[PDB]
Each structure stands twice: as structure tokens, then as C-alpha cells.
Design an enzyme around this catalytic site. Structure first.
Site, PDB file in Angstrom:
ATOM      1  N   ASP B 147      31.714  13.479  23.103  1.00 18.10           N
ATOM      2  CA  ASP B 147      31.224  13.683  22.028  1.00 18.10           C
ATOM      3  C   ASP B 147      31.268  15.311  21.552  1.00 18.10           C
ATOM      4  O   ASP B 147      30.354  15.715  20.791  1.00 18.10           O
ATOM      5  CB  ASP B 147      29.712  12.946  21.729  1.00 18.10           C
ATOM      6  CG  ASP B 147      29.739  12.794  20.288  1.00 18.10           C
ATOM      7  OD1 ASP B 147      30.708  13.103  19.409  1.00 18.10           O
ATOM      8  OD2 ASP B 147      28.521  12.816  19.877  1.00 18.10           O
ATOM      9  N   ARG B 151      30.240  19.752  15.396  1.00 21.05           N
ATOM     10  CA  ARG B 151      28.514  19.347  15.000  1.00 21.05           C
ATOM     11  C   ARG B 151      27.706  19.453  16.208  1.00 21.05           C
ATOM     12  O   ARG B 151      26.490  19.417  16.136  1.00 21.05           O
ATOM     13  CB  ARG B 151      28.479  18.155  14.201  1.00 21.05           C
ATOM     14  CG  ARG B 151      28.698  16.819  14.985  1.00 21.05           C
ATOM     15  CD  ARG B 151      28.911  15.351  14.329  1.00 21.05           C
ATOM     16  NE  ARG B 151      29.533  14.807  15.716  1.00 21.05           N
ATOM     17  CZ  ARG B 151      30.565  14.354  15.924  1.00 21.05           C
ATOM     18  NH1 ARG B 151      31.844  14.600  14.896  1.00 21.05           N
ATOM     19  NH2 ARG B 151      31.076  13.723  16.887  1.00 21.05           N
ATOM     20  N   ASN B 152      28.271  19.296  17.425  1.00 22.25           N
ATOM     21  CA  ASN B 152      27.541  19.007  18.617  1.00 22.25           C
ATOM     22  C   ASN B 152      27.724  20.568  19.518  1.00 22.25           C
ATOM     23  O   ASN B 152      27.501  20.691  20.790  1.00 22.25           O
ATOM     24  CB  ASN B 152      28.034  17.968  19.603  1.00 22.25           C
ATOM     25  CG  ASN B 152      27.642  16.876  18.981  1.00 22.25           C
ATOM     26  OD1 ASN B 152      26.585  16.656  18.407  1.00 22.25           O
ATOM     27  ND2 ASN B 152      28.329  15.710  19.410  1.00 22.25           N
ATOM     28  N   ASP B 165      23.831  18.354  22.421  1.00 25.12           N
ATOM     29  CA  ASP B 165      23.754  16.868  22.507  1.00 25.12           C
ATOM     30  C   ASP B 165      24.294  16.183  23.606  1.00 25.12           C
ATOM     31  O   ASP B 165      25.576  15.790  23.383  1.00 25.12           O
ATOM     32  CB  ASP B 165      24.740  16.440  21.077  1.00 25.12           C
ATOM     33  CG  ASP B 165      23.529  16.690  19.757  1.00 25.12           C
ATOM     34  OD1 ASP B 165      22.663  17.506  19.792  1.00 25.12           O
ATOM     35  OD2 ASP B 165      24.175  16.015  18.678  1.00 25.12           O
TER      36      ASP B 165
HETATM   37  N1  LIG Z   1      18.053  23.122  20.573  1.00 29.46           N
HETATM   38  C1  LIG Z   1      18.468  23.211  19.041  1.00 29.46           C
HETATM   39  N2  LIG Z   1      18.145  24.588  18.559  1.00 29.46           N
HETATM   40  C2  LIG Z   1      18.478  24.534  17.337  1.00 29.46           C
HETATM   41  N3  LIG Z   1      18.700  23.656  16.475  1.00 29.46           N
HETATM   42  C3  LIG Z   1      18.918  22.587  17.016  1.00 29.46           C
HETATM   43  C4  LIG Z   1      18.874  22.274  18.345  1.00 29.46           C
HETATM   44  N4  LIG Z   1      19.061  20.811  18.883  1.00 29.46           N
HETATM   45  C5  LIG Z   1      19.465  20.401  17.339  1.00 29.46           C
HETATM   46  N5  LIG Z   1      19.608  21.249  16.413  1.00 29.46           N
HETATM   47  C6  LIG Z   1      19.660  21.034  14.833  1.00 29.46           C
HETATM   48  O1  LIG Z   1      18.699  20.336  14.486  1.00 29.46           O
HETATM   49  C7  LIG Z   1      19.240  19.707  13.409  1.00 29.46           C
HETATM   50  C8  LIG Z   1      18.787  18.106  13.669  1.00 29.46           C
HETATM   51  O2  LIG Z   1      19.829  17.209  13.777  1.00 29.46           O
HETATM   52  P1  LIG Z   1      20.006  16.330  15.039  1.00 29.46           P
HETATM   53  O3  LIG Z   1      19.906  17.109  16.191  1.00 29.46           O
HETATM   54  O4  LIG Z   1      18.954  15.319  15.172  1.00 29.46           O
HETATM   55  O5  LIG Z   1      21.448  15.666  14.976  1.00 29.46           O
HETATM   56  P2  LIG Z   1      22.288  15.149  13.446  1.00 29.46           P
HETATM   57  O6  LIG Z   1      21.402  15.370  12.583  1.00 29.46           O
HETATM   58  O7  LIG Z   1      23.504  15.989  13.494  1.00 29.46           O
HETATM   59  C9  LIG Z   1      22.703  13.677  13.978  1.00 29.46           C
HETATM   60  P3  LIG Z   1      22.614  13.071  15.692  1.00 29.46           P
HETATM   61  O8  LIG Z   1      21.325  12.594  16.156  1.00 29.46           O
HETATM   62  O9  LIG Z   1      23.778  12.148  15.684  1.00 29.46           O
HETATM   63  O10 LIG Z   1      23.128  14.583  16.580  1.00 29.46           O
HETATM   64  C10 LIG Z   1      20.789  19.984  13.446  1.00 29.46           C
HETATM   65  O11 LIG Z   1      20.882  20.910  12.429  1.00 29.46           O
HETATM   66  C11 LIG Z   1      20.946  20.343  14.722  1.00 29.46           C
HETATM   67  O12 LIG Z   1      22.030  21.062  14.657  1.00 29.46           O
HETATM   68 MG   LIG Z   2      24.373  16.327  16.813  1.00 28.37          MG
END
Ligand SMILES: Nc1ncnc2c1ncn2[C@@H]1O[C@H](COP(=O)(O)OP(=O)(O)CP(=O)(O)O)[C@@H](O)[C@H]1O
Ligand SMILES: [Mg+2]
Ligand SMILES: Nc1ncnc2c1ncn2[C@@H]1O[C@H](COP(=O)(O)OP(=O)(O)CP(=O)(O)O)[C@@H](O)[C@H]1O
Ligand SMILES: [Mg+2]
Lengths: 291, 286
Positions: B147, B151-152, B165
Site C-alpha cells: 500500500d 497518503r501512507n 501504515d
Molecule cells: N504516527 C503518526 N504521526 C502523525 N500523524 C499520524 C501518524 N499516523 C497517522 N497519522 C495521521 O493521522 C491522521 C488519521 O488518519 P489515519 O491514520 O486513520 O488514516 P486515513 O484517515 O488516511 C485512512 P486509513 O485508516 O485507511 O489510513 C492522518 O492524517 C494520518 O496521516
Molecule cells: Mg493512511
């Protein structure tokens, strides 16, 4: 790769996509204006909802949206079901066109109408019972169409301009006669807090597993959009369900309606009421209200 | 359900102060937190961390995937260009997976926020090189991300690129998993043809994804196959369709993307080759 069904096909040039209704996990829903969609009223623009894929859509997202469209074709028209109006399936992205419900999902609807000081217009006890009865009628209809929703919850109920309750989100719905599907389904994608024990532990889905879910839906309604098993993480619900844990009585709830919830949550599925029995019992409570 | 305790990764709940949510996800929630003992060398020292946990409407698969993500991150060593596991709370409460905080969030939003109406060409190449190093490291740890996308990728306060992710990441040696996978939960527009059509996942399928990541970077967070719905990409990929060159992109870097998208996986560059080629471009730039 998308199925052709000329009787459901709506022309793209008659559909004007408008405001997105929320950014979505497995797709996007958008408000749209459809001009011919009501055959009685050609030249009249009907406001509709259009389910479609997002840019980051998975193979499963496309599968699920097609399945949802086909499940809605198989289910007849009913007042308390979101009905399929049409589809754009040819020479472009898949559009699944459904009834717009102007007042959104029931969870947000209830929460928006909460009285102050829990931490616009208030709902009466009679309104909450009317709500429950309407949804019981929706599920009695679904059961009769051989349809298990599997994802019955307040967030999957939509409210129209006229406060008509409509069961929605048929993406996870299955025909009870789909042996091959139920024989191989591995890891569940159903919210754990709404799942019947037999569905959770044994992967057994029936109308009686939907009845369990209905009980949680009742609890959601009478807490004015509360979250089930408050303070209990999903991680620990597994163990608590096996030990016969059940939720306590909401604030806006009679002992009668709470005993109905408890019946919906019988350990033995065949000992839970049928939707038919729930419609009759709720009708009687609604007419005996004495505001 | 109940998790076994892995004492070397276990963090006590009373040392973790949950703070601001970083966005409600689809399969979970991420929250900022303060962890005091988290660095064993520095017990007195409060580290700002991210905590991945389930939501109230969590599915059985959401719990599976969060456990898998924790286990996958245990296998992966420390690296500057990877979000690393710091710890977990797995006992007598909800599962908390504690990871490195990246203050500037995902790369897609970061690039889009800095679009002309802030990034140099050298910055975008530095970005690409850093991420190539991250993936070279992952491949070497027997990790297929599956993936890889803008965005990841997360950006730290110091503009360090971190691959994130690991929820969908698999060990190459996970044959039982690969034998039964039914319908893919991987965004189609980032999937190698062999991954999409044949369910074949390798480091070379990650390299395809890296090519799409490159395209995302040089479009300043553009959407791949612009104007092409997923529905029609299936057919177009079988006929050898490939994206065109971004505006902010040299012919050299565009040919690298095209190499990442070779029809034959073994003919795509390795991450090792991508690190060396990008290093050379970075030193010859400006
Ligand atoms: N370790 C970390 N430090 C800072 N920000 C983080 C993080 N892990 C995730 N995020 C951020 O927190 C937010 C919450 O989104 P999340 O991580 O749940 O994914 P997402 O909303 O893009 C959909 P998915 O669940 O499929 O990833 C996003 O902006 C992500 O980039
Ligand atoms: Mg994500
Ligand atoms: N026919 C319809 N009329 C009006 N609102 C609708 C609708 N169908 C869906 N909606 C609402 O549009 C919003 C869409 O938000 P989003 O796309 O995030 O879906 P969701 O939050 O329900 C997740 P999912 O549907 O995947 O379970 C929700 O508030 C949903 O209830
Ligand atoms: Mg929903």
C-alpha cells in the site's frame, strides 16, 4: 466488467452531481439532480443520492457497490427502505442512484435533537416508539424478501423530510439462501458491538441475528444516539458476551421497551422475537401511548 | 479474544497520556500522546508519540489488522525513513499500538499545501531518494508494504519522509495468507498489474507502487490516472496504458517511473538500484 441492465439504466446527461454528503470509507455519496427519474413526472428534477467509487477505491469497493445495487433490485419497494431509483453502469464510473433522505442518518438526527445537560426540536417518547415501529416494519419486509442486512444500526438508517425512517446501506446484505457465501467468509467486517453472539463466534447469519442488531438499534434510539457498551472496548466485548453481559435501560425508555430489547438479545436465536412479532408488539405500544 | 504479552514491547498505560486525535480513520483512530518511560535509556523523558487504536464501531477484521500491523512493525528494524514501533498496551484494556509522531502529517496533504497558486526540484528529489532508502530497508527486512502511496508517507517536523501504515504489509514467507486472499483491499491505482490480476505480491510489486509515489511527488500530490475512473483502469492496464510526465519532472526521472512500471516485474529496478540512481541525480541537481 459492470453488468448491463437496461430497465435500471439512467442516462448520465440527465444527472447533475452536486454537494458530497460525506467523504466515505469504501465510496462517496453525492447529492444530485435527476430530471427523468420519476417516469410519472418527466422534465421534473428529483433530488437524489449517488453512491460512487473514490480515486483510492479497491477491487472489493467496486464488488461491494455492484452487490449493493443488485441486492436493492432483488428487494421490492417499501416505505421504510431506501429504494434504488437507477444506475449509470456504461461508458463511465458506476453511479448507484438512491432516494435522498434530507435529514441524514438517524444517529446524527437523534443526537442533534438531544435536550441540553446530558454533557433542534426535541423528540417525544411517542416519536422514538414511532421510529422503532417504522424500522421494525422495514426489517419485517426485508426478512420476507429473504434479505439479512447484517449491518443494522442507527448510522445505517436515514430520515426523510417527512421523518420517515428508511433502512439503508445494503452493501453487506446477503440472501439467507446464499449457502456458498456463508460457507466461506473468514474474518468479519461487521461492527462487533451490533453483532449477534452466533454471528460473532460461529459466522451464523439469519433474520434472528438481524433481530439482535435491532435490539442494539432500539438501545441507540432510546439513548438519543448513544454508543453501545459505553466504556467497553470491542477487545473485551468478546469475553463479556460469552458470559451473558447485556446493556442496561436507557433514560428515554419504559421497562416494557427495555424487556423487548432484552428479548431481542436472547442467547438462543429462535427464542428472540421475529420481526413480525416486533411489529405487532410495537404497534400495540404506539396506540396505547397516552402521551 | 485475548493477546499474549510480549514483555519487551509492553508499555504501562499509566505512563501514556492520550491527547488530541490526529483524524478519525476508517478502520481505527490515531491520537497524539505523551509517553514518559518509552525510551528505556531515558526513563524521566516524555516523548510525543502517535497511538493507533480501534474505534467504537470496529469490526473483527479491524482488530486482526491492528494486531498484524503491530507484529509486522516488530519484525522491521529501526530506520530513519520508516515510522517505527515504540511500544504497545495489549493487556486489561483496548489495544494501543504506539508509533513515532510525525508533526506535519501525510505527504499527499504536505505537497498539496505547498502548491503554487515552497518545494524546490531538489526537495522533491530528496523526498524520492529518502523514500527509496526506506523501501530498500523494508525489502531487506522481508516486508512487502502492498500500500505504498503519498497518503501512507508521513513528514516529521524536520521534513524527514517516513513510510507508514503497515496494516496491509505482509512477510514474503506468509504463504497461508497469500493462498486465500479473495477480493483485494489495495487501492487499484497504486497496484502492479500482477498484484491486481493474479494476486502476486513481491518487492517488485512495491517498486510499481514506488513509481506511482514518484508521480504523486512530482505532481505536488496529484491523483494518479487523472480523469480515469478505477472501473476503466482494469482494461487500460491490460493494454499497457501508462501515465504521462508531470510538469515538475525531468526526462531522466520520468524514465525511472516508466522503469518502475515495466510489464515484467523482474525487469523493474530493485530499490537498491533506485537508491543509487536517485543519489546520483540528487548530487548532480543544483
Ligand atoms: N504516527 C503518526 N504521526 C502523525 N500523524 C499520524 C501518524 N499516523 C497517522 N497519522 C495521521 O493521522 C491522521 C488519521 O488518519 P489515519 O491514520 O486513520 O488514516 P486515513 O484517515 O488516511 C485512512 P486509513 O485508516 O485507511 O489510513 C492522518 O492524517 C494520518 O496521516
Ligand atoms: Mg493512511
Ligand atoms: N440516500 C441518502 N440520502 C441522504 N444522506 C445519505 C444517503 N446515503 C447516505 N447518506 C449519508 O451521507 C453521509 C455519507 O458519509 P460517508 O460517505 O462517510 O458514509 P458513512 O459515514 O455512512 C460510512 P459507510 O456508509 O461506508 O458505512 C452519511 O451521513 C450518510 O448517512
Ligand atoms: Mg453507513
Amino acid at each position: 466488467e459492470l453488468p448491463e441492465d437496461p430497465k435500471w439504466e439512467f442516462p448520465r446527461d440527465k444527472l447533475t452531481l452536486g454537494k458530497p454528503l460525506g467523504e466515505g470509507c469504501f465510496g462517496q455519496v453525492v447529492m444530485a439532480e435527476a430530471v427523468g427519474i420519476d417516469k410519472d413526472k418527466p422534465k421534473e428534477a428529483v433530488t437524489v443520492a449517488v453512491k460512487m467509487l473514490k480515486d483510492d477505491a479497491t477491487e472489493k469497493d467496486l464488488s461491494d457497490l455492484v452487490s449493493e445495487m443488485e441486492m436493492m433490485k432483488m428487494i421490492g419497494k417499501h416505505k421504510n427502505i431506501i429504494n434504488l431509483l437507477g444506475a449509470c453502469t456504461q461508458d463511465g464510473p458506476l453511479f448507484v442512484i438512491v432516494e435522498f433522505a434530507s435529514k441524514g442518518n438517524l444517529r446524527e438526527f437523534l443526537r442533534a435533537r438531544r435536550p441540553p445537560g446530558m454533557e433542534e426540536e426535541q423528540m417525544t417518547f411517542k416519536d422514538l416508539v414511532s421510529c422503532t415501529f417504522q424500522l421494525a416494519r422495514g426489517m419485517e419486509f426485508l426478512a420476507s424478501q429473504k434479505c439479512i442486512h447484517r449491518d443494522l444500526a442507527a448510522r445505517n438508517v436515514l430520515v426523510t423530510e417527512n421523518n420517515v425512517m428508511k433502512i439503508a446501506d445494503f452493501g453487506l446484505a446477503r440472501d439467507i439462501n446464499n449457502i456458498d457465501y456463508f460457507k466461506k467468509t473468514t474474518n468479519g467486517r461487521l461492527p462487533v458491538k451490533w453483532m449477534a453472539p452466533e454471528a460473532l463466534f460461529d459466522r451464523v447469519y439469519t433474520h434472528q441475528s438481524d433481530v439482535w442488531s435491532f435490539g442494539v438499534l432500539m438501545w441507540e434510539i432510546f439513548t438519543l444516539g448513544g454508543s453501545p457498551y459505553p466504556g467497553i472496548p470491542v477487545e473485551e466485548l468478546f469475553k463479556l458476551l460469552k458470559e451473558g453481559h447485556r446493556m442496561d435501560k436507557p433514560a428515554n425508555c419504559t421497562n416494557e421497551l427495555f424487556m423487548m430489547m432484552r428479548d431481542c438479545w436472547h442467547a438462543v436465536p429462535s427464542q428472540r422475537p421475529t420481526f413480525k412479532q416486533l411489529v405487532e408488539d410495537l404497534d400495540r405500544i404506539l396506540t396505547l401511548t397516552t402521551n
